[PDB]
Amino acid sequence: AINLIDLLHDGFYLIFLIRNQYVPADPQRFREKILDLLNRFEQQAKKLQFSADDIHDAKYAFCALIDETIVTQQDPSYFNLQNSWLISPLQLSLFGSQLAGYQFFEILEQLRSRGKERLAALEVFHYCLLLGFQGKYRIESIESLNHLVARVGDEIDYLK
C-alpha cells in the first residue's frame, strides 16, 4: 500500500519549498541532503521489492525535476544556489545526461504503454509534471503540456 510517491515524500517537500520561494541557507549541504534522500529512497524501495527499473526511473524523474526547478528560478536570491548547483547538476552527476527535457517524455511514453505493470513509476512521472516540470515543452507550446498532464492523470485514474 506504500507507493513510490510516498517514499519520495521527503524529497518532494524540498521541491515544494523551492517552488514556494524558500532558499536553502547552505546550497552544498542542501545537495548532500538530496543525495542521501535518494539513497534512502532506493534502499527502502529495494526492500519493498519494487523493480530496479521503477527505482531507477523514479529517481531519474526526481533529479530531472529538482534540476529544472532550481535552474529556472529568476529571482536574485537564488543566485548562489544556482551557481553552486550548475557545477554539477544531478542529471549529469548521477546519469551523465543532459537530455532529460526530452528523455523524461520518452520514459513517460514507455510507462503509459505498460499501464498497470509500471503504474507505481508512472504515478511519480505524473507528480513531477504537477509540481512544475516542463522539460522540452517549455519552448514548444505550453498548452500541449497541460493536456498531456491531464490525460496521463486520466489514465492513472482509469488504471485503478
Taking the C-alpha atoms of residue 95 and residue 93, their distance in angstroms, rounded to an integer, is 6
Name the experimental technique: X-ray
Instruction: Give the CA distances from residue 88 to residues 12, 16, 71, 95, in Å, rounded to whole numbers and listed in that order.
Output: 20, 21, 12, 11
Smallest Cα–Cα separation from 109: which of 84, 126, 127, 92?
126
List of domains in the chain: 4-159 (1.25.40.590)
C-beta of residue 140 within 8 angstroms of C-beta of residue 72: no
Question: Å resolution of this model?
Answer: 2.6
Contact of 106 with 96, CB cutoff 8 Å: no
